[PDB]
Amino acid sequence: VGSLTINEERSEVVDFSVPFIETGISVMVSRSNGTVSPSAFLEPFSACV
Amino acid sequence: ERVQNSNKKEWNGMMGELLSGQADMIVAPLTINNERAQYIEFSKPFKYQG
């Protein structure tokens, strides 16, 4: 009843039931502080006027 | 759906077709309930969704 998935070499040896929950493989990172926006948002927009 | 012929209940659609042998493999974006799983073997759920 442990929280384990299968690969192809598990499934020949072990015999799962229907999967009750779904999960996947992720990575974990942390936050940054701020974003890039080089003072040019309306600069091509207002250039039309 | 319940057929009106003294208490017969028949699967319709593809479920009727596979149960009558007209189809052999059913690839479809179909969810899995207990009702279809009462009679029909299901594979592993490929595309998880909500």
Length of chain A: 49
- Residue A33 sits at the vertex; the CA angle it makes with A30 and A35, to the nearest 5 degrees, is 115
Q: Best interface-test mutation with B: which of A22, A23, A25 has the largest number of B CBs within 10 A?
A: A22
For residue B33, what are the CA distances in angstroms to A1, B2, B13, B36? 22, 18, 16, 6
- Smallest CA–CA distance, residue B3 to chain A, in Å, is 31
- Smallest CA–CA distance, residue A22 to chain B, in Å, is 7
Burial of A9 (0-12, 13-18, 19+ CB in 10 A): exposed
Give resolution, Å, one decimal. 4.4
CB of B15 within 8 A of CB of B23?
no
| Dihedral (Cα; A25, A28, A29, A31), 10-degree rounding | 110
